[PDB]
Amino acid sequence: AHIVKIYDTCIGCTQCVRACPLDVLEMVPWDGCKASQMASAPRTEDCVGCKRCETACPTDFLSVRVYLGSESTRSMGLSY
Amino acid sequence: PFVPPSWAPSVFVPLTGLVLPAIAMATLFVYIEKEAP
Amino acid sequence: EVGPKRGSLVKILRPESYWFNQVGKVVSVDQSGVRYPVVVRFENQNYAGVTTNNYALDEVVAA
Amino acid sequence: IWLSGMYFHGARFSNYEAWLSDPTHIKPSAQVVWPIVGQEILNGDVGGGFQGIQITSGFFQLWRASGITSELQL
Amino acid sequence: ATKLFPKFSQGLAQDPTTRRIWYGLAMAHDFESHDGMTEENLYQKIFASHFGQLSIIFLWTSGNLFHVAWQGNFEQWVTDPVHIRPIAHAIWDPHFGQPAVEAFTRGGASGPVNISTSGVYQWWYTIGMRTNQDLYVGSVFLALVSAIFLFAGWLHLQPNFQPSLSWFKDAESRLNHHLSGLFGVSSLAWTGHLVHVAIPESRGQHVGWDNFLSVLPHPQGLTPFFTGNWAAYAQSPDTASHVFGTAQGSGQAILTFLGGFHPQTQSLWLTDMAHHHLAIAVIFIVAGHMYRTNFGIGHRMQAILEAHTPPSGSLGAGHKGLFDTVNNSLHFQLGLALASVGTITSLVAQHMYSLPPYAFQAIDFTTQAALYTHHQYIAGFIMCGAFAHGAIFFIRDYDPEQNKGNVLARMLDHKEALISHLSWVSLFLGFHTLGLYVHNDVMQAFGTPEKQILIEPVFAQWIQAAHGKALYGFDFLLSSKTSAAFANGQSLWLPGWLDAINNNQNSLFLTIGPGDFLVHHAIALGLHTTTLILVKGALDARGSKLMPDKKDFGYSFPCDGPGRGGTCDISAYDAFYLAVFWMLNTIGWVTFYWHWKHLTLWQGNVAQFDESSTYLMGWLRDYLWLNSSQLINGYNPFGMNSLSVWAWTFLFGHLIYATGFMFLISWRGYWQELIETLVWAHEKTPLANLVYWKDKPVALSIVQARLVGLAHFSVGYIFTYAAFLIASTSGRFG
Amino acid sequence: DIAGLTPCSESKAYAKLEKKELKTLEKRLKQYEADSAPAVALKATMERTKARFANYAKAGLLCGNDGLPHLIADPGLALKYGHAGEVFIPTFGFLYVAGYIGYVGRQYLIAVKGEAKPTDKEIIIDVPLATKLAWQGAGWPLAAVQELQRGTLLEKEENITVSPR
Numbered sequence A: 001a002h003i004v005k006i007y008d009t010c011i012g013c014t015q016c017v018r019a020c021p022l023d024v025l026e027m028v029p030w031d032g033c034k035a036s037q038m039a040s041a042p043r044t045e046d047c048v049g050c051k052r053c054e055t056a057c058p059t060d061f062l063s064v065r066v067y068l069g070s071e072s073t074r075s076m077g078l079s080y
Numbered sequence B: 001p002f003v004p005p006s007w008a009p010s011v012f013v014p015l016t017g018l019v020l021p022a023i024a025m026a027t028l029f030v031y032i033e034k035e036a037p
Numbered sequence C: 001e002v003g004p005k006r007g008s009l010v011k012i013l014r015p016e017s018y019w020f021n022q023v024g025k026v027v028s029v030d031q032s033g034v035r036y037p038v039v040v041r042f043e044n045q046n047y048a049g050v051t052t053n054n055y056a057l058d059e060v061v062a063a
Numbered sequence D: 001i002w003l004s005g006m007y008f009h010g011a012r013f014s015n016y017e018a019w020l021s022d023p024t025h026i027k028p029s030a031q032v033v034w035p036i037v038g039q040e041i042l043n044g045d046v047g048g049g050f051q052g053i054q055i056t057s058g059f060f061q062l063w064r065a066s067g068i069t070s071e072l073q074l
Numbered sequence E: 001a002t003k004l005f006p007k008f009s010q011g012l013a014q015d016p017t018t019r020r021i022w023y024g025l026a027m028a029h030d031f032e033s034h035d036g037m038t039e040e041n042l043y044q045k046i047f048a049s050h051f052g053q054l055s056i057i058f059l060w061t062s063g064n065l066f067h068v069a070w071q072g073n074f075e076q077w078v079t080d081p082v083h084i085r086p087i088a089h090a091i092w093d094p095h096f097g098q099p100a101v102e103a104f105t106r107g108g109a110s111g112p113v114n115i116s117t118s119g120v121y122q123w124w125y126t127i128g129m130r131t132n133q134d135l136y137v138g139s140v141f142l143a144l145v146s147a148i149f150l151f152a153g154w155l156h157l158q159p160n161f162q163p164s165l166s167w168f169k170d171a172e173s174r175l176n177h178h179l180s181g182l183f184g185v186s187s188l189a190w191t192g193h194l195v196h197v198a199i200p201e202s203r204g205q206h207v208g209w210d211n212f213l214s215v216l217p218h219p220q221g222l223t224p225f226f227t228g229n230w231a232a233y234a235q236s237p238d239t240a241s242h243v244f245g246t247a248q249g250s251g252q253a254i255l256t257f258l259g260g261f262h263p264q265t266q267s268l269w270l271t272d273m274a275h276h277h278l279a280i281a282v283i284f285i286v287a288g289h290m291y292r293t294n295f296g297i298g299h300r301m302q303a304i305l306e307a308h309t310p311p312s313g314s315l316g317a318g319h320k321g322l323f324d325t326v327n328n329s330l331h332f333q334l335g336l337a338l339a340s341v342g343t344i345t346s347l348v349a350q351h352m353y354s355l356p357p358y359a360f361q362a363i364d365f366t367t368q369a370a371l372y373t374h375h376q377y378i379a380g381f382i383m384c385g386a387f388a389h390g391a392i393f394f395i396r397d398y399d400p401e402q403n404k405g406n407v408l409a410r411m412l413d414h415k416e417a418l419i420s421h422l423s424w425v426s427l428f429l430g431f432h433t434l435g436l437y438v439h440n441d442v443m444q445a446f447g448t449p450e451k452q453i454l455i456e457p458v459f460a461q462w463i464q465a466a467h468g469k470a471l472y473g474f475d476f477l478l479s480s481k482t483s484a485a486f487a488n489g490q491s492l493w494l495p496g497w498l499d500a501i502n503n504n505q506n507s508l509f510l511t512i513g514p515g516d517f518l519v520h521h522a523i524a525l526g527l528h529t530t531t532l533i534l535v536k537g538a539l540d541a542r543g544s545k546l547m548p549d550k551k552d553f554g555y556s557f558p559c560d561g562p563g564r565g566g567t568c569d570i571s572a573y574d575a576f577y578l579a580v581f582w583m584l585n586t587i588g589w590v591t592f593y594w595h596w597k598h599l600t601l602w603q604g605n606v607a608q609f610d611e612s613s614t615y616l617m618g619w620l621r622d623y624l625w626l627n628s629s630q631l632i633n634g635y636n637p638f639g640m641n642s643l644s645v646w647a648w649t650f651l652f653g654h655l656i657y658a659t660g661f662m663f664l665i666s667w668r669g670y671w672q673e674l675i676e677t678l679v680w681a682h683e684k685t686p687l688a689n690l691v692y693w694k695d696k697p698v699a700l701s702i703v704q705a706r707l708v709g710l711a712h713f714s715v716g717y718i719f720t721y722a723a724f725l726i727a728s729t730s731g732r733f734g
Numbered sequence F: 001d002i003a004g005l006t007p008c009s010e011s012k013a014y015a016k017l018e019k020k021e022l023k024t025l026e027k028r029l030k031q032y033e034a035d036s037a038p039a040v041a042l043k044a045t046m047e048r049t050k051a052r053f054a055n056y057a058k059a060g061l062l063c064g065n066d067g068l069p070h071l072i073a074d075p076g077l078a079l080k081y082g083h084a085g086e087v088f089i090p091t092f093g094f095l096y097v098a099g100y101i102g103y104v105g106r107q108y109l110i111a112v113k114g115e116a117k118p119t120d121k122e123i124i125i126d127v128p129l130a131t132k133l134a135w136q137g138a139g140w141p142l143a144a145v146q147e148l149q150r151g152t153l154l155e156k157e158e159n160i161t162v163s164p165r
């Protein structure tokens, strides 16, 4: 399983969620920014680490990171 | 007092070319695939 | 109240920012309880092609 | 434009007629370099009282196959 | 599944792929990142591993002694070594055919032996071996010693004898013993062996383990040593009419200072080497009492580091707090060790081609070639390792707050200046070197060879005139007969050195000209470039502007994906990865250059070098093309000869090399899809869907394939050049 | 002489190479006529060749054992023995023109940063301004040492340095 962490510079623009091809990110209520939202990663056992969430983040140096870790049969994307 | 015999390459070469690789690879292959209880 | 006024030029001190030690222009300063209220534009773009970023109060200097 | 260049260089800067007079022993040449820093050694002795770079593109055999006998037609 | 292999990393022994096998082979010696690794356990494992390495070294040397003593002809080689070739070992290959064995049987043997291009024969003849029996005794002894070291390595893991952590990290007590004991006493004892055995064997005698207790090494003996008459050990040394293995012109001296070479054997005198090891034994033993142990007078290294911060603050804190990072980290110490050992290795090569120590060296030319090339390539790899462990130090063991203001933080503060100026010198040397070579090529191609730039290397010729080479007409400091240095050294240690430096037949201070100018600049280009890549990788390991948290990923991580324009090869591992190619190139240049200059020296025409060395066609035609005539004729449809094995290795290298390109050029995912279709095919094939994988097959990971491609590149490169060098030099002169 | 060689005037290898080149050239010349443009070009080559040898002999060049000229790169040595025209004068000439190019470029860059769209005037050259600055810097070194001594040549530490340390 990989390590996906959301940081506090998030502005809650939902770009990371629409870019995730595996549905491991979701938007939770929050009271720290104008949009009153913040991303969260409740299902990092389904993540494969494609790093589209990092590409979609607008704020400079990113508000979401994907640290690579120990692979499994789901995090390798093996269909056989 | 030490001398290896005249027939020594003939025996020791295929031993270390064929036998020890065979035992090594078979033993290691059983070791690799073992399941932890 | 809380921040420098719009149109003014500021200087970034947040290190991980791509525009560290450079000059930007302020757009708006949020008055609410946001953690990062200062919206700064820049005339060049970072690697990702974005030219706008939020910053904290102490990380910008009127210069 | 390219074909026109080839026919022009065949017409003006070659030894096509000297080649038609004797195809063996006279090698096809259709390019002449200018006498500057020393590149003039590239002008080879191609036969026929001519000097230049031997061509392998084989326009001369094509022209003889079409019937061209003079540089004016080129 | 949750397989056993490997036990050091639980997360690795978890996945059902074939990644676990390769990674389990790859992370075995990464002790710092196993499961449950404390610090004491780390040091103890490193200690036992050192014992393992020592065991392997001594066992290997015993192997060399045994094979030379059994299958070689060392007993016959010592009678005439400008003749019958050395013998390494004998072959028993059932794949041979009749002319093969008929061909390989050479050197006076009775079967397929192959020549020993290693220089062990000259070493063992100089130090004082003469028969087989002594070699066997040495082999048995070294095998026994290897067994002792292996047992000790097992011993110090047993839980009663495990040293605690603070026994390690004891700097001051380790250096006194290393410097005094390990260097000084070993050097003193080696002087003992030279004086007692090696000299009287070179006078003609058999001083063995029998009757070395009853033989005077000098016919006065420990009277002048205890009187203070030491110059009575140097009177009447060996005459220049000497014959080495006999008593003809034999002297009596044991500690001289002559310089020069032996007039009949083209090596250094043994008495000088006795005196040298004696002198530096005294120096090292005296230098071993600097630091503090459980006594009074010693030094503290922390005080010494603390007090050296300069006033005016040109350095911030100077060396404050370094002692708690040199002591606390292993990659820092390993980096320093690899740096020193690599530079010393180069020095070994550079001195052993020019000042040959061993008897009848430099008349076996293949020995010279293989020795120098070997040590050069070894030095290259060692230096690359030094910078790699620098990068690992920065990522894993560096702490900023402990290093606030010392020189180590200053180096991280202004690193862009370093990288910029290394880039500048690399560019400058590249443009001008390549330009001058291309200009000389163009001039040579047209009919005018006098229109080309041939700069005379006047600096190095100034230096060679400073050392005594009286050919350039400069007349100063050792070449002038009225200098202070010349007159002071004249009476005892100059006249050998001058006769050895004005000879144009030895390798000592070869005559140089414009080709040497150009090639030395090429070498400087190699060094500055490789330093650029390595230093950039080391200093940008904490983070860059493309990525300011590179420290959170560790040393060797693949990439950061397509974002921000895509970041391939961003890790420090990949910087070192790029540097390896430059190391191979640069050593290629120095070794091509050395080899060709000495080929033209040994053949006879230095003119061919001094003319054809100034334009690259000279290299391609007169070195690579002309000298590979007897190599590739190692076998043909007409027959084969001795150098057929080399002519097969020579293609083998290319094959490995070209396979090396595959893992570099074609990156991963293509192979992933191909392997997936293969999985489908083996899954649906009838009568072969009865045999399955236990661990699912996947393609090689991004980091691994770089290492594999580099392995093929390096191995093929080395095998090809070794084949060409041995085959060419031993085909001509051998 | 200068590191064990001789000047090309009495160098035996020099005249041998000269004779060899003339020999091959006349060998090429033999098979043509006396009015043909081949022979015209060949005789032109003879003239240029012999003139080149005379020019290299006249300038006091130094030849090794191959009969080829050798350049001396040392200020004291070349200035003492009359060889300032092979490295020394060329290096000062090149440094002049190279600093000239660099200075002109830099002045253009500062001249165009002060506009409303610096990128357009970088991709589309302001030709009047470029020719103007192309003239205005023929004496660059004086302006360079003035910019150095006033402290405007160097930006201060408002340059962007990598984060972090």
Ligand code: CLA
Binding pocket: B004, B008, B009, B010, B011, B012, B013, B016, B017, B024, E059, E060, E061, E062, E063, E064, E066, E089, E090, E091, E092, E143
């Ligand atoms: C470590 C150094 C070393 C090396 C590289 C070699 C190399 C060789 N030996 Mg050898 N040998 C050595 C030491 C060495 N020897 C010693 C110390 C002895 C005395 C016991 C011998 C006695 C010996 C005989 C009697 C014969 C050879 C022969 C050979 C050749 C065929 C290979 C073979 O069958 O070896 C067999 C080698 C041995 C049985 C001795 C090895 C003993 C140690 C304990 C093993 C070391 C284990 C090793 C480090 C672990 C690597 C494996 C690991 C990767 C899984 C080959 C050239 C044959 C030959 O000459 O053919 C022409 C042959 O008949 N060797």
Ligand code: CLA
Binding pocket: D001, D002, D004, D005, D006, D008, D013, D032, D033, D034
């Ligand atoms: C397309 C094929 C082709 C090729 C490869 C060549 C190649 C050559 N020709 Mg040639 N030629 C061609 C077609 C070609 N020609 C045609 C079609 C004709 C008939 C009009 C000629 C007539 C011709 C003559 C009469 C001569 C050559 C010569 C030459 C040689 C020297 C050219 C030279 O020095 O240029 C000189 C360099 C320039 C003119 C530089 C111009 C570059 C400008 C400034 C670029 C500006 C950019 C601009 C936006 C784009 C150009 C637009 C255009 C309308 C100008 C060279 C081998 C000479 C030769 O063989 O001597 C022995 C010669 O005397 N050619």
Ligand code: CLA
Binding pocket: E046, E047, E050, E051, E054, E168, E170, E173, E174, E175, E177, E178, E181, E182, E183, E344
């Ligand atoms: C006098 C006592 C003494 C002696 C002899 C040694 C000796 C050694 N210690 Mg040691 N040690 C000592 C006291 C001593 N120590 C004390 C008191 C402590 C506690 C502070 C330690 C703590 C300690 C640790 C923690 C470790 C050692 C290690 C070692 C070994 C180093 C590896 C090696 O072989 O280097 C050999 C080096 C040389 C022979 C010198 C090389 C000199 C130059 C570079 C070579 C060139 C010379 C010449 C040209 C070569 C000729 C070539 C020839 C083939 C022709 C070595 C056996 C290490 C080891 O291997 O553990 C097993 C290790 O990890 N020791």
Ligand code: CLA
Binding pocket: E025, E026, E027, E028, E029, E030, E031, E338, E381, E382, E383, E384, E385, E386, E388, E392, E555, E556, E573, E576, E711, E715
């Ligand atoms: C003093 C010697 C020394 C020591 C003790 C170490 C120790 C270490 N190094 Mg290191 N290193 C050294 C020299 C040394 N290195 C040199 C000289 C280089 C330059 C090449 C490097 C380059 C280097 C890199 C780049 C890295 C290390 C790493 C490491 C650490 C883990 C090693 C590991 O897991 O490898 C396991 C070892 C293997 C899997 C063996 C692989 C086999 C190689 C590819 C050779 C194969 C060639 C083949 C045998 C040819 C056969 C020919 C055929 C025809 C028969 C460890 C602390 C790694 C680390 O710290 O990770 C963060 C790391 O990234 N080192």
Ligand code: CLA
Binding pocket: E458, E459, E462, F074, F075, F076, F077, F080
């Ligand atoms: C790149 C470095 C370098 C090197 C290795 C040399 C090498 C040499 N120069 Mg030299 N030189 C250089 C750069 C260099 N030059 C530059 C840049 C200048 C311009 C300032 C000079 C100006 C110069 C003069 C004016 C003279 C030399 C001379 C010499 C020769 C002997 C003096 C010497 O080595 O001093 C060591 C040089 C250095 C450590 C490099 C720094 C450069 C200094 C300034 C030159 C030192 C000159 C020296 C003091 C004169 C000694 C007189 C001699 C009779 C004893 C020697 C071949 C002398 C000569 O003609 O010899 C026959 C001489 O008269 N040089």
Ligand code: CLA
Binding pocket: E420, E421, E423, E424, E427, F102, F103, F104, F105, F106, F108, F125, F130, F133
């Ligand atoms: C004209 C502006 C200009 C100026 C003032 C400089 C100045 C400098 N460059 Mg640089 N450079 C430039 C353009 C310029 N460069 C361009 C266009 C490129 C390629 C895209 C480079 C590529 C480059 C590299 C790769 C490196 C430098 C380096 C350097 C520094 C050392 C000098 C050097 O090595 O030059 C060498 C110059 C080159 C290799 C290329 C020069 C290209 C042409 C000749 C210049 C451009 C002329 C310009 C188009 C004219 C436009 C003006 C006109 C519109 C009026 C120096 C500060 C080096 C450095 O960092 O040193 C610390 C270094 O590593 N530069």
Ligand SMILES: CC1=C(/C=C/C(C)=C/C=C/C(C)=C/C=C/C=C(C)/C=C/C=C(C)/C=C/C2=C(C)CCCC2(C)C)C(C)(C)CCC1
Binding pocket: E331, E332, E334, E335, E336, E339, E343, E386, E387, E389, E390, E391, E393, E538
């Ligand atoms: C990265 C890194 C690292 C590493 C580094 C390195 C690797 C380095 C190297 C370095 C080197 C490798 C250096 C070298 C040096 C050398 C020198 C410095 C030399 C000197 C010499 C001399 C001084 C000489 C002199 C003389 C002469 C001239 C002759 C005569 C004699 C005499 C002696 C006088 C470390 C680990 C630290 C850590 C951090 C990071």
Ligand SMILES: CC1=C(C/C=C(\C)CCC[C@H](C)CCC[C@H](C)CCCC(C)C)C(=O)c2ccccc2C1=O
Binding pocket: E662, E663, E664, E666, E667, E668, E671, E672, E675, E698, E699, E700, E701, E702, E705
């Ligand atoms: C061929 C290839 C593969 C496919 C490679 C595979 C599937 C492995 C092939 C190895 C076979 C299975 C065995 C090779 C035989 C060796 C002798 C094995 C040595 C094992 C050591 C332990 C000795 C990749 O996965 C890849 C990934 C990234 C870049 C380039 C490439 C690439 O070029």
Ligand code: SF4
Binding pocket: A004, A019, A020, A021, A022, A023, A024, A025, A046, A047, A048, A049, A050, A051, A052, A053, A054, A066
């Ligand atoms: S790496 Fe891919 S799967 Fe994982 S969170 Fe990001 S977008 Fe989703």
Ligand code: SF4
Binding pocket: A006, A009, A010, A011, A012, A013, A014, A015, A016, A017, A038, A039, A056, A057, A058, A059, A063, A064
């Ligand atoms: S893309 Fe970035 S800023 Fe936008 S919601 Fe996701 S993490 Fe937050």
